[PDB]
Symmetry: D2
């Protein structure tokens, strides 16, 4: 079963935990995530960016998730991360995806709203949930609480990505997270909040953001560093080695450690049954 | 569409070419093969051994092939290579596979026949084609023409793997292929013949075996060496690199060269439409 | 695509129309409904009861609806009407259905709530929307009329996506013009913000159904009128063609009669051109 | 699982039975056939003609058969009966069907061969088996009777998996006991080793069908008797129940009448306990 995240993030919100959202690339990266989530009874979101689908097309990622849903006996929420076009999201929703992020955050408010609204209208007709973003990751760079209230009112989005100090990738210095702004947003925004850029954020800061209303925590970079680091080590030690059953498994196992760490921080263990 | 190889190997036989049978492991290895086969208009067989499916289960390999069949607009023959048990083949055929190899070649003739026959009876009830083997790869080590005639008569197999001097893996010295024995087998066996162990066999020898009746050429080792060699080089040059879109693509591109070389030797270009 | 009705009934509520929910039986009945909904650009819900699925199993109805979704290029909402247990609903949701009605209305409040809650918990984990019922269906006393304050508490405790109300309608035909408790409906709507559902709408006057939609009905269930029209046409064909035997003729005559009902119900629900 | 009939008709040929091939229309007709085939452990072919699929489209029939395959835990062979062009067969094979009949029998030999060959070339690339016809159906001269030597050449030139013969059968009922050209059948079998197919088997005496199987028929097509039995039962129910309307009753009465025909044809074909 492939599902949206409408009920899922509401449950996270109501119970004080967040759903980890992991960016995936292929069979082994999906499987690594699901081996841990199934064991820990954690919900999960499996996400791909447009660049993801230039490597393995969505039709094949979808097919893999549909089969893995049966294999691990769990419905799965496949999610379009940082998509930017209504036409592209339409094609991908027709292909079966039921969660999308439309990211218009580098546009002025009015144009962001128009883009996002066009995506909400289509996606809700397809039973697809919609995330959008107000504020840029990394003024323009912090989400304003009253603006976020209005943004959600004009768009009808199911969840909202906020800008409170996180950034994609590694941080060169420990980030500064604006917990007071987060608290203020949560006071006036009722839809589930989303935290991007969570790789390399101290666990105590992520935990605090979930206490203050974060329902979805996105992790991409740490997964890739772990996977790749292990494959690199394996080829160094095995110059004549060539069987993916061996080298991809060492990548999977290093990635699994990160997945367990993130489930722990998100508080998502034992939230499904 | 997922299909058997019943018509496919008959066409190869009738037109003097062979179908390349490539062992696959995951999305990228399947895709690499199909990018070349679709471009060259070549039929192909995508094969997995039992160990293959311990890495990515058949249900997920099946799902990938079903999606890739649509993506490349071609029915695909997924094939169980060197399977050894009726129960396991039954499960995998129920999961959708429509070509199987039952390898009882390390058993005495009578027990090989009993095993193979049990598999033929089931598989034909499921519209699944069946390959079997008489003679061991590497006396016991060369297929006897009259024994191969009787073997096919008692089993009802759709194709027959023969032992004429090939071996799995690389050869330490140029192999000696028994072309006269092959010719003798072909005189008394009417079902399509299969050549295992084709990695590292000189092209001129494979070409001659197809002139003398080989219809299916199995290649595994050369694919893995190429893929892995390229990934290894990429990590050496990119110690901090981590995106599978980059490193898996360099593996795919090195593998594609091998795939094109094998299509050329097999004479399978422009055999589909 | 097979979908839930969560966004669908919210759009109906916000725009003051209702989605017609037609009980189906087989390919021809689904097809007749979709022919009309396609041409009138109307949303629809396709419903089956436990007894339906003892004739043609849910897996086969699901397969038909999935295929018809592609054929008509429209997501479709298949719905379990008047289902009664968690074990059965779980299998049918696992089989692909994304909208269910758990009918616990025969049981006292607390037992009703506990049953419904078990189904909502499961179904929401599957992205399946859930309808439930408080008060019993049947014309004109307390068992047969939803109490507004109980309705508020019921929806709060269970987490249902929509509520089937009991306001004087009944399954089947009415022996006399029904008395519908419009005031009660209004008072439920006052305290319940989830979409409301009207059962028993066959043979209810159009004026009355329209009024219930003005008062918050978002889903109108119709079964009996469809079967009477289908069967009546088939009856008449056989009388007219005593040697006739080709189902391509007689099932189409039945379809065409049922299509007239479907159009009439789309008209009363105000669902044309809402897609 | 949806499969071709290539191994199926070879088993029938080798064991001296025939597979019954029943024309279907919708869910109830498929279901009636599978109920009986399941209990009698008989293989079956489910067939639809172009006109069938103008009532309920192939994609929906396919979806039903796929689901029924799972429900009955048996691979099923869906078959395109009397299809006429490559463009249509290509779409229906792409839609999932793995057995087709290309009927070029209206055309002169060479045109027949060229058409059939185009379909065999395509279908075999899709793992779809192909039936074709030489000579025209209809009771008792040359157009209506397959020539053995022409049959040999036809099968050689086209590569078909099975051959529909013309030996005196006709679609529909017979106004008098048909004269079947058993000798001709034998002479075709002499020179054609691919499985043979008998069309028009409704209303042919059991003795005669049995004889054709002894002479090489591997597939027996039945349509008309199924519809007469279904419709006759529905006719009688409506007469007995002038207010009746529930399709769960009247479609089951029709099913049950058709099941009696299905049993009778399994009996004549000798296909029980061959699975
Ligand atoms: Na980060
Ligand atoms: Na080798
Ligand atoms: Na009623
Ligand atoms: Na007849
Ligand atoms: Zn992000
Ligand atoms: Zn081998
Ligand atoms: Zn009702
Ligand atoms: Zn016919």
């Amino acid at each position: 079963s492939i599902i949206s995240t409408k009920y899922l993030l509401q449950d996270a919100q109501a119970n004080g935990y967040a759903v980890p959202a992991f960016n995936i690339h292929n069979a082994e990266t999906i499987q690594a995530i699901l081996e841990v989530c199934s064991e820990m009874r954690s919900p999960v979101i499996l996400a791909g960016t447009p660049g993801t689908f230039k490597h393995i097309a969505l039709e094949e990622i979808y097919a893999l998730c549909s089969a893995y849903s049966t294999t691990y006996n769990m419905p799965l929420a496949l999610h379009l991360d940082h998509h930017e076009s209504l036409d592209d999201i339409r094609r991908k929703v027709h292909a079966g995806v039921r969660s999308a992020m439309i990211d218009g955050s580098h546009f002025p408010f009015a144009e962001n709203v128009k883009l996002v609204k066009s995506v909400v209208d289509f996606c809700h007709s397809q039973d697809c949930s919609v995330e959008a973003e107000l504020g840029r990751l990394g003024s323009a760079f912090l989400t304003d609480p009253q603006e976020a209230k209005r943004f959600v009112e004009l768009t009808g989005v199911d969840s909202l990505a906020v800008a409170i100090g996180t950034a994609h990738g590694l941080y060169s210095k420990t980030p500064k997270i604006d917990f007071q702004r987060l608290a203020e947003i949560r006071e006036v925004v009722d839809v589930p909040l989303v935290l991007h850029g969570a790789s390399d954020v101290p666990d105590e800061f992520v935990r605090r953001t979930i206490e203050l209303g974060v329902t979805k925590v996105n992790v991409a970079t740490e997964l890739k560093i772990a996977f790749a680091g292990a494959v690199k080590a394996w080829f160094a030690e095995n110059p004549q080695g060539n069987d993916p059953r061996y080298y991809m498994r060492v990548g999977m196992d290093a990635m699994k450690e990160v997945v367990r760490n993130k489930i722990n921080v998100c508080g998502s263990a034992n939230r499904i049954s």
